Design a protein around this motif. Structure first.
Motif, PDB file in Angstrom:
ATOM      1  N   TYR A 157      44.179  31.574  43.420  1.00 32.11           N
ATOM      2  CA  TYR A 157      43.037  32.198  42.769  1.00 32.11           C
ATOM      3  C   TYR A 157      43.454  33.523  42.151  1.00 32.11           C
ATOM      4  O   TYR A 157      44.215  34.288  42.745  1.00 32.11           O
ATOM      5  CB  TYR A 157      41.873  32.393  43.748  1.00 32.11           C
ATOM      6  N   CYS A 158      42.968  33.779  40.943  1.00 31.62           N
ATOM      7  CA  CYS A 158      43.293  35.023  40.265  1.00 31.62           C
ATOM      8  C   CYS A 158      42.526  36.180  40.887  1.00 31.62           C
ATOM      9  O   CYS A 158      41.306  36.111  41.056  1.00 31.62           O
ATOM     10  CB  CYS A 158      42.971  34.914  38.779  1.00 31.62           C
ATOM     11  N   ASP A 159      43.243  37.248  41.233  1.00 29.71           N
ATOM     12  CA  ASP A 159      42.622  38.447  41.780  1.00 29.71           C
ATOM     13  C   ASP A 159      42.838  39.660  40.882  1.00 29.71           C
ATOM     14  O   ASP A 159      42.769  40.798  41.352  1.00 29.71           O
ATOM     15  CB  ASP A 159      43.121  38.711  43.208  1.00 29.71           C
ATOM     16  N   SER A 160      43.077  39.439  39.593  1.00 31.11           N
ATOM     17  CA  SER A 160      43.344  40.517  38.655  1.00 31.11           C
ATOM     18  C   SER A 160      42.030  41.088  38.121  1.00 31.11           C
ATOM     19  O   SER A 160      40.943  40.723  38.570  1.00 31.11           O
ATOM     20  CB  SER A 160      44.262  40.027  37.541  1.00 31.11           C
ATOM     21  N   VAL A 161      42.127  41.980  37.132  1.00 35.66           N
ATOM     22  CA  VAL A 161      41.040  42.916  36.850  1.00 35.66           C
ATOM     23  C   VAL A 161      39.864  42.228  36.156  1.00 35.66           C
ATOM     24  O   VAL A 161      38.701  42.501  36.477  1.00 35.66           O
ATOM     25  CB  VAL A 161      41.578  44.127  36.056  1.00 35.66           C
ATOM     26  N   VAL A 162      40.133  41.324  35.211  1.00 33.07           N
ATOM     27  CA  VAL A 162      39.040  40.680  34.487  1.00 33.07           C
ATOM     28  C   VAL A 162      38.300  39.705  35.390  1.00 33.07           C
ATOM     29  O   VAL A 162      37.067  39.625  35.359  1.00 33.07           O
ATOM     30  CB  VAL A 162      39.557  39.993  33.212  1.00 33.07           C
ATOM     31  N   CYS A 163      39.033  38.956  36.211  1.00 34.21           N
ATOM     32  CA  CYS A 163      38.387  38.095  37.191  1.00 34.21           C
ATOM     33  C   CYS A 163      37.711  38.895  38.297  1.00 34.21           C
ATOM     34  O   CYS A 163      36.772  38.392  38.918  1.00 34.21           O
ATOM     35  CB  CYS A 163      39.402  37.116  37.777  1.00 34.21           C
ATOM     36  N   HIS A 164      38.171  40.120  38.556  1.00 30.31           N
ATOM     37  CA  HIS A 164      37.433  41.020  39.436  1.00 30.31           C
ATOM     38  C   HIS A 164      36.098  41.413  38.821  1.00 30.31           C
ATOM     39  O   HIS A 164      35.080  41.468  39.518  1.00 30.31           O
ATOM     40  CB  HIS A 164      38.273  42.258  39.745  1.00 30.31           C
ATOM     41  N   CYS A 188      48.418  36.759  40.388  1.00 24.66           N
ATOM     42  CA  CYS A 188      48.128  37.658  39.285  1.00 24.66           C
ATOM     43  C   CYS A 188      47.399  36.902  38.176  1.00 24.66           C
ATOM     44  O   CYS A 188      47.084  35.714  38.296  1.00 24.66           O
ATOM     45  CB  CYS A 188      49.416  38.294  38.770  1.00 24.66           C
ATOM     46  N   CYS A 189      47.127  37.611  37.085  1.00 24.59           N
ATOM     47  CA  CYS A 189      46.307  37.075  36.006  1.00 24.59           C
ATOM     48  C   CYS A 189      46.922  35.819  35.408  1.00 24.59           C
ATOM     49  O   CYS A 189      48.113  35.783  35.089  1.00 24.59           O
ATOM     50  CB  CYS A 189      46.124  38.133  34.928  1.00 24.59           C
ATOM     51  N   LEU A 190      46.101  34.784  35.275  1.00 24.43           N
ATOM     52  CA  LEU A 190      46.544  33.476  34.824  1.00 24.43           C
ATOM     53  C   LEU A 190      46.516  33.334  33.311  1.00 24.43           C
ATOM     54  O   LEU A 190      46.735  32.232  32.803  1.00 24.43           O
ATOM     55  CB  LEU A 190      45.688  32.383  35.468  1.00 24.43           C
ATOM     56  N   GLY A 191      46.259  34.419  32.586  1.00 24.03           N
ATOM     57  CA  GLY A 191      46.173  34.351  31.141  1.00 24.03           C
ATOM     58  C   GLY A 191      45.007  33.533  30.647  1.00 24.03           C
ATOM     59  O   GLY A 191      45.123  32.848  29.630  1.00 24.03           O
ATOM     60  N   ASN A 192      43.890  33.570  31.363  1.00 23.14           N
ATOM     61  CA  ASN A 192      42.683  32.830  31.028  1.00 23.14           C
ATOM     62  C   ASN A 192      41.467  33.710  31.249  1.00 23.14           C
ATOM     63  O   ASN A 192      40.432  33.259  31.746  1.00 23.14           O
ATOM     64  CB  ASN A 192      42.581  31.552  31.857  1.00 23.14           C
ATOM     65  N   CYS A 193      41.583  34.986  30.877  1.00 26.54           N
ATOM     66  CA  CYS A 193      40.631  35.992  31.331  1.00 26.54           C
ATOM     67  C   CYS A 193      39.275  35.860  30.654  1.00 26.54           C
ATOM     68  O   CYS A 193      38.262  36.273  31.227  1.00 26.54           O
ATOM     69  CB  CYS A 193      41.208  37.384  31.100  1.00 26.54           C
ATOM     70  N   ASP A 194      39.228  35.293  29.449  1.00 25.53           N
ATOM     71  CA  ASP A 194      37.949  35.108  28.774  1.00 25.53           C
ATOM     72  C   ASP A 194      37.108  34.015  29.418  1.00 25.53           C
ATOM     73  O   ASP A 194      35.895  33.976  29.199  1.00 25.53           O
ATOM     74  CB  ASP A 194      38.172  34.790  27.296  1.00 25.53           C
ATOM     75  N   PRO A 212      35.943  33.559  36.341  1.00 27.68           N
ATOM     76  CA  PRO A 212      37.142  33.630  37.186  1.00 27.68           C
ATOM     77  C   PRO A 212      37.931  32.323  37.218  1.00 27.68           C
ATOM     78  O   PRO A 212      37.365  31.258  37.001  1.00 27.68           O
ATOM     79  CB  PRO A 212      36.574  33.964  38.565  1.00 27.68           C
ATOM     80  N   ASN A 213      39.230  32.417  37.474  1.00 26.96           N
ATOM     81  CA  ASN A 213      40.143  31.297  37.325  1.00 26.96           C
ATOM     82  C   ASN A 213      40.858  31.009  38.633  1.00 26.96           C
ATOM     83  O   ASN A 213      41.099  31.908  39.442  1.00 26.96           O
ATOM     84  CB  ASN A 213      41.185  31.571  36.237  1.00 26.96           C
ATOM     85  N   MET A 214      41.197  29.740  38.831  1.00 25.80           N
ATOM     86  CA  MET A 214      42.066  29.347  39.926  1.00 25.80           C
ATOM     87  C   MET A 214      43.060  28.322  39.412  1.00 25.80           C
ATOM     88  O   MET A 214      42.876  27.726  38.353  1.00 25.80           O
ATOM     89  CB  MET A 214      41.291  28.772  41.117  1.00 25.80           C
TER      90      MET A 214
HETATM   91  S1  FES Z   1      42.343  38.464  34.906  1.00 23.33           S
HETATM   92 FE1  FES Z   1      42.152  36.481  35.841  1.00 23.33          FE
HETATM   93  S2  FES Z   1      42.934  35.092  34.320  1.00 23.33           S
HETATM   94 FE2  FES Z   1      43.405  37.097  33.546  1.00 23.33          FE
END
Ligand code: FES
Ligand SMILES: Cc1cc2nc3c(=O)[nH]c(=O)nc-3n(C[C@H](O)[C@H](O)[C@H](O)COP(=O)(O)O)c2cc1C
Ligand code: SF4
Ligand code: SF4
Ligand code: SF4
Ligand code: FES
Ligand SMILES: [Ca+2]
Lengths: 905, 156, 148
Positions: free
Chosen positions: B81-88, B122-128, B131-133
């Protein structure tokens, strides 16, 4: 180049970086990841200075001094407030995870991290969170591992992999969880792993052998000495506490060993601390062993020697020049015998003749790293002359250095140099009976018997120069390999030919001399290196004398009725049955030694000689350099009953009591003067060190640091009255702190490196003229001979090829860094590191004899049926049995010998 | 002990053909072993080092540097699971809590049946579309805590 | 492209040999740093390298190496096909050509659009991303990723 540091002008080398230039100027910049021998990588970020664009610039920017060239007109500031704040912040960041370990850490008082924490002025902790923690690994018997103390400076991996070419140490993990160690628990496999304890600026890698009897650096008594465990002559600082030898530190010699030792020298010192050593003179009266003092031992020995009709003396390559000379003076030149066998003496004298009459320069150990192609003939250098193997690895990296210099990359930018070079290397060709540890970097390895290696050398010399004798019977594939070696050596600007006496073949040394002569005749800047066996093999060769076989003949025929054996166990150079019979036949055997040897059972008198830690003297290393070693401690300081003197002192007093019936304990400079008066070839040993009257502004050189502790309590249990300071009439050193050890003192013998603010091995920066260069007033030790004007002739005695005879097994020598040297194999820490006894067999020979790996087979040599387990050697040629030279029961004279009735037990 | 299979070894030499230095196939050799066996066991380090002609310390340094090369045993399916800033910003915390509740394991752990292992990434490059997994090879976007149990059933 | 002669040996009959590989990563953010990328491509731990020397002189395996982003190399063919004059007159800004710009995170239309340089961030936020979602007020923004 001209630089301006804090408004002060300085002239520096423009090819240096700013860190090494400023440290060479005496300025203090904190640093972790840079080392003088490893180059700059810019990891730790400790060495920040403020660089300005010009003189009229007040802003500047923070730069890494180790990564910044010291170019002309460079304006920097060390004491800038932002630079000082950043350096303190780097120390603080390192301090966030550092364990509260200094009282129970072996690095304490010798720790570069402690010194730089104090130097940056960081003493207040404001970090309040948790510290990261690591589990430790077992790294073998020499190195102790404590990863909590790591500051991730990457010095260990850079040294171990990029410098020493080791494979089993690395860095794992990422971010703040980076780990430095082995991929699993096990012994560190590199022969130079012990330099990690000085390379690592923290207490991660520590000396386990010192850790057993630990004491701090300020409590040590140090002396400048020479390592006694092989012929290379690396400079060491032995440190003693409470009457026992505690540690061997590297003593910087910019000409010989600079920063590095090998593990045999660093950890093989344990024989000095053995409890079975003779401490008093002992006389065998029937079945009784009575103890004498020095005077009555001299009187009784002199009386018995006066009654004898002929006294012979048997020297040793273990003993110093002065001790061997004193024995030679006691018995007479015609009655003096070298303690080595006839074949060993012939090989050693041939190596000496090639060195001082061959017309080809022999390089010092540091100079080996500057050669462009290396041919090693016969000598397993890693097991016999290990530091030469390390220097050869550096010379191999010379090609990447040259390729990076062509691309205008600075010589200290080591990562760029290694990236440009990739796997390119200078040509290396090693020959041995089996595989060597240099095979990972060698361009070619020749696994062959010693006659075939000699024939390969003779063929190389003949293809280099047609006047050299030719070799008949070379196969086309071997011919193609020979041509590859020939175009590699001919195209080299500085070829180096390495050989030695450890192969057990005269023809190998002759072939190496022929190759060097052929390269010299083509105008190449060729160097030749000979690896001898022991610490003073070259000195004993220069002195000369009869072989051990002639001494045993004199004892057996009854012509000699008294024998004085100096520092020689006599079983490594001749068969034990013959030695025991000849010594039992002699009515007087006197043994002057510091180790309890097997020939002391039949000895009528045993003189408790001093080892190198308790004695002074001179040793000649493999390159002919005379080096003085100084006494570390007084053995009689704690145990007042200990009568343990220098061997030359014993023998000079014995000679005086024999002549004039009076004792004479003499002085070291008197014996050195007698040596240079009687033997003109050893006249250079006078200038190896100044005499005992040498002073630095009227004061002697201190053996121990100024903060040496426990003066009024270390002997208080024996007596509350403090004893007199031990007096040193022999040398310029004093057995106290009351002396000089300033880095600016005009001397060359440095007992230990310490400067205020630099308690670690980094104080050697303060003791050098430039960092990584030489000692400020010259490296110690002088060369006995210069390169001769004319060379030798070509050796025309080309041997025939090896033929396996049925029922006869040629003994192929296998040497081990841990086990082949006699005194170091007596060290208790070496027993775990020692390989188990074995015999190497070809698969075809083992299949013919119907044995597998591990089966115990028996063979008879000189009427001694001994049994060893078999291991299979792929690279050994058939008709040969591989035996570990120098071990217990296997003398090094067995190399090149033959074996009968080798069958399964 | 560990023994490299014929397919793994052949794939490793085929990747060694793609570069001028066989060390450059180390990451893909570790990935080949991981793809075959779920993770890289301890003997695989020495096996890959022997095939590549590089020290085992270098292979272990590579394997422990890169987060997606697993040097500990994992489950049959790896949820990342993505825990980066946009998914946050888009609310990955509800997704993480739903995974906690459904799987009864903390991040970095493996379920008792060996079915799933939960990992932040980290960010999966799918931030738009967050949230992503990322379950084993499939990326799932526009995650809601209600759709997590339905998503976890199609991975047996 | 290999089956149609665009890749491999003798591309377009010009004698130029070019082989294109795909190296799949193993999950570290530092691997995108170009010298750390080169270290990772060589099969090592992805530590970056000090510059100078730059990868153009001594990069991958010591050879001359050029590292470029996907979008730069994707901008190359339109430059080569339509010419320099078309690329300069895309927009009247100091940064030439088009750029993929977007807005992400609790906006009405999070996404990605190809826009000329000099487009204001308000134009991307309202005219393309649709503004913030209903009930949410704008507080801050990061222009170019987590490191801005
Ligand atoms: S911040 Fe989660 S896919 Fe980029
Ligand atoms: C920590 C770090 C990570 C980076 N990650 C990437 C990345 O993932 N992709 C990328 O194209 N550039 C990344 N870069 C930028 C590169 O170093 C380099 O500038 C770029 O990849 C190639 O240059 P170009 O933009 O001219 O094409 C990163 C830089 C740093 C410092
Ligand atoms: S490594 Fe140095 S600073 Fe760290 S605990 Fe040991 S003595 Fe103290
Ligand atoms: S173990 Fe020592 S030498 Fe190695 S990175 Fe850590 S502090 Fe430096
Ligand atoms: S190379 Fe020889 S002289 Fe040097 S440390 Fe090793 S054993 Fe001692
Ligand atoms: S010594 Fe310069 S950054 Fe480490
Ligand atoms: Ca003395």
């Amino acid at each position: 180049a001209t630089i301006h540091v804090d408004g002060k002008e300085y002239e520096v080398n423009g090819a240096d970086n700013l860190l090494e230039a400023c440290l060479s100027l005496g300025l203090d910049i904190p640093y972790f990841c840079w080392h003088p021998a490893l180059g700059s990588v810019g990891a730790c970020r400790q060495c920040a200075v403020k660089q300005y664009q010009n003189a009229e610039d007040t802003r500047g920017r923070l730069v890494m001094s180790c990564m910044t060239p010291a170019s002309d007109g460079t304006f920097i500031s060390i004491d800038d407030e932002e630079a000082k704040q950043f350096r303190e912040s780097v120390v603080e960041w390192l301090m966030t995870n550092h364990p509260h370990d200094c009282p129970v850490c072996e690095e304490g008082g010798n720790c570069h991290l402690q010194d730089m924490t104090v130097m940056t002025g960081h003493s207040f902790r404001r970090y309040r969170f948790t510290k990261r923690t690591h589990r430790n690994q077992d790294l073998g018997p020499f190195i102790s591992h404590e990863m909590n103390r790591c500051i991730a400076c990457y010095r260990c991996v850079r040294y171990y992999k990029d410098y020493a070419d080791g494979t089993d140490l690395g860095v794992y993990g990422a971010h703040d969880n980076v780990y430095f160690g082995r991929p699993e628990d096990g012994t560190l496999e590199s022969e130079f792993s012990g330099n990690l304890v000085e390379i690592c600026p923290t207490g991660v890698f520590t000396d386990k052998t010192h850790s057993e009897r630990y004491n701090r650096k300020w409590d040590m008594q140090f002396a400048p000495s020479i390592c006694q465990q092989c012929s290379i002559g690396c400079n060491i600082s032995p440190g003693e506490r409470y009457g026992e030898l505690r540690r061997i530190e590297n003593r910087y010699n910019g000409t010989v060993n600079h920063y590095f030792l090998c593990d045999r020298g660093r950890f093989g010192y344990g024989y000095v601390n053995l409890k079975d050593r003779p401490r008093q003179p002992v006389q065998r009266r029937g079945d009784d062993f009575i103890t004498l003092n020095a005077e009555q031992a001299m009187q009784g020995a002199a009386d018995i020697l006066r009654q004898s009709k002929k006294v012979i003396g048997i020297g040793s390559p273990r003993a110093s020049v002065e001790s061997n000379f004193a024995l030679r003076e006691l018995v007479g030149e015609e009655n003096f015998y070298t303690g080595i066998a006839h074949g060993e003496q012939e090989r050693l004298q041939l190596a000496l003749k090639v060195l001082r009459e061959g017309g080809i320069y022999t390089p010092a150990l540091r100079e080996i790293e500057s050669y462009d192609a290396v041919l090693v003939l016969g000598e397993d250098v890693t097991q016999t002359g290990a530091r030469v193997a390390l220097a050869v690895r550096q010379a191999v990296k010379g090609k990447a250095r040259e390729m990076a210099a062509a691309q205008k990359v600075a010589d200290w930018q080591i990562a760029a140099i290694l990236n440009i070079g990739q796997r390119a290397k200078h040509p290396l060709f090693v020959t041995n009976v089996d595989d060597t540890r240099l095979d990972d970097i060698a361009a070619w390895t020749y696994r062959a018997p010693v006659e075939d290696q000699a024939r390969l050398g003779f063929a190389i010399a003949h293809a280099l120069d047609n006047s050299a004798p030719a070799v008949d019977g070379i196969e086309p594939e071997l011919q193609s390999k020979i041509d590859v070696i020939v175009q590699a050596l001919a195209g080299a600007k500085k070829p180096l030919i390495i050989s030695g006496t450890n192969a057990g073949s005269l023809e190998v040394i002759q072939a190496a001399a022929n190759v060097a002569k052929a390269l010299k005749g083509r105008g190449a800047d060729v160097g030749i290196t000979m690896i001898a066996r022991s610490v003073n093999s070259m000195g004993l060769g220069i002195m000369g004398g009869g072989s051990l076989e002639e001494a045993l003949t004199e004892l057996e025929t009854g012509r000699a009725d008294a024998v004085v054996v100096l520092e020689n166990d006599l079983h490594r150079h001749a068969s034990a049955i013959r030695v025991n019979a000849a010594l039992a036949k002699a009515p007087l055997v006197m043994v002057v030694d510091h180790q309890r040897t097997a020939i002391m059972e039949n000895a009528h008198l045993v003189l408790s000689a001093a080892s190198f830690a308790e004695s002074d003297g001179t040793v000649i290393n493999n390159e002919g350099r005379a080096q003085r070693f100084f006494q570390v401690y007084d053995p009689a300081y704690y145990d007042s009953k200990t009568v343990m003197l220098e061997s030359w002192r014993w023998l000079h007093s014995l000679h005086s009591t024999l002549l004039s019936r009076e004792v004479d304990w003499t002085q070291l400079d008197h014996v050195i003067d007698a040596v240079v008066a009687k033997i003109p070839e050893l006249a250079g040993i006078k200038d190896a060190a100044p005499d005992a009257t040498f002073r630095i502004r009227g004061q002697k050189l201190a053996r121990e640091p100024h903060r040496y502790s426990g003066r009024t309590a270390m002997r208080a249990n024996i007596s509350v009255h403090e004893p007199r300071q031990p007096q040193d009439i022999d040398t310029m050193f004093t057995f106290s702190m009351e002396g000089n050890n300033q880095p600016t003192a005009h001397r060359s013998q440095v007992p230990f490196a310490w400067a205020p603010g630099w308690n670690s091995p980094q104080a050697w920066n303060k003791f050098q003229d430039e960092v990584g260069g030489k000692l400020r007033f010259g490296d110690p030790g002088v060369r006995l001979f210069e390169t001769s004007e004319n060379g030798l002739d070509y050796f025309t005695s080309v041997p025939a090829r090896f033929q396996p005879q049925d029922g006869k097994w040629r003994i192929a020598p296998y040497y081990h860094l841990f086990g082949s040297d006699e005194l170091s194999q007596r060290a208790p820490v070496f027993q775990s590191r020692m390989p188990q006894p074995y015999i190497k067999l070809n698969p075809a020979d083992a299949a013919k004899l119907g044995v597998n790996a591990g089966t115990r087979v028996s063979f008879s040599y000189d009427g001694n049926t001994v049994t060893l387990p078999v291991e299979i050697a792929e690279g050994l040629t058939a008709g040969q049995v591989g035996l570990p030279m120098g071990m217990s029961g296997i003398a090094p004279v067995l190399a090149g010998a033959h074996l009968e009735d080798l069958k399964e037990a | 002990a560990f023994e490299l299979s014929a397919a793994e070894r052949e794939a490793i030499e085929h990747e060694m053909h793609h570069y001028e230095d066989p060390r450059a196939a180390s990451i893909e050799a570790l990935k080949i072993v991981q793809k075959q066996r779920g993770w890289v066991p301890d003997g695989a380090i020495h096996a890959i080092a022997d095939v590549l002609g590089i020290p085992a310390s270098d292979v272990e340094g590579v394997a422990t540097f890169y987060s997606q090369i697993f040097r500990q045993p994992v489950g049959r399916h790896v949820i990342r699971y993505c825990d980066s800033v946009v998914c946050h910003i888009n609310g990955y915390q509800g997704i993480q809590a739903a995974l906690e509740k459904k799987l009864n394991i903390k991040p970095g752990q493996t379920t008792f049946d060996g079915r799933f292992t939960l990992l932040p990434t980290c960010c999966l490059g799918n931030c738009d579309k967050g949230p992503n997994m990322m379950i084993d090879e499939d990326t799932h976007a526009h995650l809601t805590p209600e759709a997590i149990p339905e998503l976890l059933e199609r991975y047996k | 492209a290999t089956e149609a002669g665009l890749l491999g040996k003798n591309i377009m009959g010009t004698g130029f040999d070019f082989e294109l590989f795909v190296h799949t990563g193993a999950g570290r953010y530092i691997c995108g740093e170009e010298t750390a990328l080169i270290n990772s491509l060589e099969g090592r731990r992805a530590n970056p390298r000090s510059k100078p020397p730059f990868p153009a002189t001594s990069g991958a395996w010591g050879k001359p190496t050029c590292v470029n982003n996907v979008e730069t190399l994707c901008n190359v063919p339109a430059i080569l096909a339509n010419g320099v004059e078309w690329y300069q007159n895309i927009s009247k800004s100091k940064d030439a050509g088009t750029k993929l710009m977007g807005f992400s995170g609790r906006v009405k239309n999070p996404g990605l659009w190809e826009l000329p340089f000099g487009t204001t961030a308000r134009e991307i936020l309202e005219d393309y991303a649709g503004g913030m979602r209903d009930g949410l007020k704008f507080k801050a923004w990061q222009p170019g990723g987590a490191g801005t």
